[model samples]
Target chain A: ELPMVERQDTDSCLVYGGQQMILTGQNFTSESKVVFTEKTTDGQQIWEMEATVDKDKSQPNMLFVEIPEYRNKHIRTPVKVNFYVINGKRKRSQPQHFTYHPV
Target chain B: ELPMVERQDTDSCLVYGGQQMILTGQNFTSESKVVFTEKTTDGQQIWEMEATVDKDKSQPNMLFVEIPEYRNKHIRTPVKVNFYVINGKRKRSQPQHFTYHP
Candidate 1:
């Protein structure tokens, strides 16, 4: 069975310069891992991030990461985040998307 | 003023393998250029392509380029093409979008 976890974040869009993301979730097994990936609208992989599990609690898990500098002159798009169990076997959580704007 | 060009493409979704795009448009002045780019959903610039202006004609412009190999496991996303004048000054045309599927 998939572990029950609660994920939450308030901030969605960030200016082109730089920003931070506050990820809050639960059921975060120390064995579990978080991966952040960016892709072109055509599904090309651009930037990716792997966050280390800092704690192993049945409560909420919070992680922070910095946004990269974007040079493109366009509107904001959707960003995908994947929550996985163990390394690969279990399953992946549904992706979360947020729009990013230029500052 | 914007150039009046008709753009057409047949293929939208390609398997996790390889595919091609047929771009049909007009008013492609030798002074005009084409640029291709990809970015993350969060508006991050990923991959970009710049096509050289090869002809000076009032008719439709046809050009082709190979799709890069994608190893990521996901669904298709949108691709954008922009037509610009000179290098940066004259201004840019509206962007065109197509979907690429895994």
Candidate 2:
């Protein structure tokens, strides 16, 4: 069976200086989990965050995360957050990113 | 071929006293059209609104509809909005609803 996938809710803007973000999506199993990652220039892993899934009836099932504030000295630096289904089997999605901004 | 389906962005609260709502959903074709329906008891059609489609890059292909305000004297009257793909094809999904509030 082909699983349905899509990003649901989004904040018009992620506070450049805040540590909490609500990332929402749909068609996720009740047991689904998320993986957040920050990558290096060569696509090597630098940092990551793992969050549990929360379901809102109004939103079928959406993921909300309280992310830590990130400050980067590098100009134009880009970071990626990957949401994955890593339970019994492994399924991954295209890394969604927070637009890199300097404080 | 099977098509992907899902709801996208949503407003946590739809102002019960307002006239416009931003309804967002994804996995819709660029040419997909929306069909809004308010059903009566015994499943009779009461009202509806049809709107064009718009696309945003951050979101692959999502639908945003500017819904007109609705007022009902009857309390707890359920309303449904059906999204249909009506471009040379007839594919429909389950009707999503807005809760009845007095």
Best by TM-score: 2
Error of 2 at B33 (Å): 0.8
Model 2 per-residue lDDT tens digits across residues A1-103: 2122344344223325334445444545555555655543323456565654444432434455544444354546443333333333544442343443543
lDDT, residue B93, candidate 2: 41
Q: What TM-score does each model's chain B reach against the true chain B?
A: 0.48, 0.53
Per-residue alpha-carbon lDDT of model 1 for B1-102, expressed as tens digits?
332222324335453424544344334444555555567779887766564443532223443334433335364663442322232455444454544565
Candidate 1 DockQ vs. native = 0.02
Each model's total of backbone clashes: 5, 1
Query: Per-model C-alpha lDDT, please?
Result: 0.43, 0.43
Once fitted onto the true fold, the runs of candidate 1 whose alpha carbons sit more than 4 angstroms away are A3-6, A13-26, A56-90, B1-102
Model 2 pairs whose backbones collide: A8-B8
Angstrom error at residue B66, model 1:
28
Tell me, per candidate, how large a share of the native contacts it keeps. Answer: 0.00, 0.00
Residue-level error in angstroms, candidate 2, position B72: 6.2
